Design an enzyme around this catalytic site. Structure first.
Site, PDB file in Angstrom:
ATOM      1  N   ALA A  79       0.833  -1.193   0.000  1.00  0.00           N
ATOM      2  CA  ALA A  79       0.000   0.000   0.000  1.00  0.00           C
ATOM      3  C   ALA A  79       0.871   1.247   0.000  1.00  0.00           C
ATOM      4  O   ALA A  79       1.734   1.418   0.869  1.00  0.00           O
ATOM      5  CB  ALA A  79      -0.926   0.000   1.214  1.00  0.00           C
ATOM      6  N   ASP A  80       0.645   2.120  -0.975  1.00  0.00           N
ATOM      7  CA  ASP A  80       1.406   3.347  -1.125  1.00  0.00           C
ATOM      8  C   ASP A  80       0.677   4.494  -0.420  1.00  0.00           C
ATOM      9  O   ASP A  80      -0.284   4.275   0.325  1.00  0.00           O
ATOM     10  CB  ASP A  80       1.647   3.621  -2.618  1.00  0.00           C
ATOM     11  CG  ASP A  80       0.362   3.686  -3.416  1.00  0.00           C
ATOM     12  OD1 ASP A  80      -0.724   3.617  -2.805  1.00  0.00           O
ATOM     13  OD2 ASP A  80       0.438   3.808  -4.654  1.00  0.00           O
ATOM     14  N   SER A  81       1.131   5.723  -0.658  1.00  0.00           N
ATOM     15  CA  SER A  81       0.643   6.908   0.033  1.00  0.00           C
ATOM     16  C   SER A  81      -0.881   6.965   0.108  1.00  0.00           C
ATOM     17  O   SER A  81      -1.461   6.890   1.201  1.00  0.00           O
ATOM     18  CB  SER A  81       1.186   8.146  -0.680  1.00  0.00           C
ATOM     19  OG  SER A  81       0.720   9.350  -0.105  1.00  0.00           O
TER      20      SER A  81
ATOM     21  N   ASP B 262      -3.067   4.734  -0.855  1.00  0.00           N
ATOM     22  CA  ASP B 262      -3.630   3.486  -0.352  1.00  0.00           C
ATOM     23  C   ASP B 262      -3.611   3.453   1.170  1.00  0.00           C
ATOM     24  O   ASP B 262      -4.594   3.056   1.802  1.00  0.00           O
ATOM     25  CB  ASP B 262      -2.866   2.295  -0.927  1.00  0.00           C
ATOM     26  CG  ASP B 262      -3.163   2.064  -2.396  1.00  0.00           C
ATOM     27  OD1 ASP B 262      -4.066   2.737  -2.933  1.00  0.00           O
ATOM     28  OD2 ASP B 262      -2.493   1.210  -3.015  1.00  0.00           O
ATOM     29  N   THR B 263      -2.499   3.876   1.781  1.00  0.00           N
ATOM     30  CA  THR B 263      -2.432   3.914   3.239  1.00  0.00           C
ATOM     31  C   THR B 263      -3.384   4.961   3.810  1.00  0.00           C
ATOM     32  O   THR B 263      -3.970   4.752   4.880  1.00  0.00           O
ATOM     33  CB  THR B 263      -1.001   4.189   3.698  1.00  0.00           C
ATOM     34  OG1 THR B 263      -0.566   5.462   3.203  1.00  0.00           O
ATOM     35  CG2 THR B 263      -0.057   3.089   3.222  1.00  0.00           C
TER      36      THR B 263
END
Lengths: 72, 79, 50, 50
Positions: free
Chosen positions: A33-35, A37-38
């Site tokens: 999970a990227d920016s 997504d988090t």
């Protein structure tokens, strides 16, 4: 329960397998999970338990274990 | 007007079927022969009237097919 | 040889370009709606906290 | 003035809640497409940032 509701939220907000999401599974490196997504993951965690979290204390959360630790 | 080729058949298709190469080719094709780039006459002929031949053979419930490698052949349907 | 290859290429290119045009557009539409609502939510969050 | 401002704050709060729910619902659906586009179809071909 809380310790499995967290998995319910994490798996369905990142799309990763339930087996993948262990207590120590970090979101960015393990779950990918990227920016954004988090960000959506923390928003979903807030919604599930109908609570709110501070910005800094929330961003400090970067793992399933940390997620539950702040949740529980 | 009446008594005019277009009433019954497209001009290009009739032109193809009237060619001197057609009977040979037809005979062969029906027998299962594949057509490659080396037999120029045949290949060129095929290329020139591809769609007419395809449409024609369709009457028989058979596909006139063109592989990517540039070779023609016949593939029959279940019917 | 030319006559063969040129054809093949034309068909390849046309399918590729039209299919990507058809799909990517709506994919980006969805991504943009999600981006927009997230941005609105973050602005609201920050203003509320402050 | 602060009590009057706490009323605007509460309006913003309700708006923020609504937006929060909508964003989460969008993400839930979009996840399926992400798992489905792991075929290497997304990296450049589908995600045309232009």
């Amino acid at each position: 329960t809380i310790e499995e509701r967290v998995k319910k939220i994490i798996g369905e907000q990142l799309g990763v397998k339930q087996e993948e999401v262990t207590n120590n599974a970090s979101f960015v490196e393990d779950l990918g999970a990227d920016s954004l997504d988090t960000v959506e993951l923390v928003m979903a965690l807030e919604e599930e338990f109908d609570t709110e979290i501070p910005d800094e204390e929330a961003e400090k959360i970067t793992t399933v274990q940390a997620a539950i630790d702040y949740i529980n | 007007s009446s008594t005019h080729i277009e009433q019954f058949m497209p001009v290009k298709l009739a032109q193809a079927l009237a060619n001197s190469l057609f009977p040979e080719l037809d005979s062969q094709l029906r027998a299962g022969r594949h057509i490659g780039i080396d037999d120029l006459d045949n290949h060129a002929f095929l290329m020139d009237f591809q769609e007419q031949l395809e449409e024609f053979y369709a009457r028989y419930n058979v596909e006139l097919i063109r592989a990517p490698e540039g070779f023609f052949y016949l593939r029959p349907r279940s019917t | 040889a030319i006559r063969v290859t040129q054809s093949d290429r034309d068909l390849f290119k046309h399918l590729i370009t039209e299919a990507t045009s058809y799909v990517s557009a709506d994919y980006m539409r969805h991504a943009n709606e999600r981006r927009t609502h997230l941005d609105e939510a973050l602005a609201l969050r920050g203003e509320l906290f402050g | 003035e602060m009590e009057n401002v706490q009323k605007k704050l509460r309006k913003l709060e309700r708006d923020y809640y609504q937006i929060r729910e909508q964003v989460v619902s969008a993400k839930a659906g979009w996840c399926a497409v992400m798992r489905m586009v792991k075929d290497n179809g997304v990296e450049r071909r589908l995600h045309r940032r232009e």
